Amino acid sequence: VIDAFRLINANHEPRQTTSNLGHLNKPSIQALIHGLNRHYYSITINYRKNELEQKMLLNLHKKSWMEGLTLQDYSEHCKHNESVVKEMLELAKNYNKAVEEEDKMTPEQLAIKNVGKQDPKRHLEEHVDVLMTSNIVQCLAAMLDTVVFK
Amino acid sequence: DYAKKRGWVLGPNNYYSFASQQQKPEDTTIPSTELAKQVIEYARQLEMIV
DSSP states (O other): OOOEEEEOOOOOOSSOOSSSSSSSSOOOHHHHHHTBTTTEEEEOOOOOOOHHHHHHHHHTTOOOHHHHHOOOOHHHHHHHHHHHHHHHHHHHHHHHHHHHSSSSSOTTHHHHHTSSSOOHHHHHHHHHHHHHHHHHHHHHHHHHHHHHOO | OHHHHTTOOOOSTTOOOOOTTTTOOOOOOOOOHHHHHHHHHHHHHHHSOO
């Protein structure tokens, strides 16, 4: 949240419009209350960058190469998989219970049905996504290392 | 004559080893390129917009 300002003399219109560039911001209610377009006017802020600035900003988040190929302790990986599958078991029980509903439910009541109560379908989808990502990544990294390192 | 026709080693008299070992294939090489391709296909199907 940033803005640039300049004042208006005691005069007419403060500025001349030779394009649409000025009228693209929809000045905020707070600024209008506190004196925008009456005691001062705004100026558009632009963030022109040079090539080196762009490259450095992009490179900021780049990680070391070894981190990419590094594997992950197999004991911890198996423990995490086991924990998530055990959770998915109870989530499947609850999902079976929930599917039996949704027919004995008012069209409006369904929306407020999931307020303060767990959503087995959503949690199952999230767990499936996390498990798939982790296992696929680990298997692919293992194979890649198997070939690269002799 | 039939022993000669077949590929029988003709060891001791009336003693022809059949080499039922079949080379006993024990060498294993961890097929890695194909497994990597399979997992990458899994990822492609998971990510692509159907």
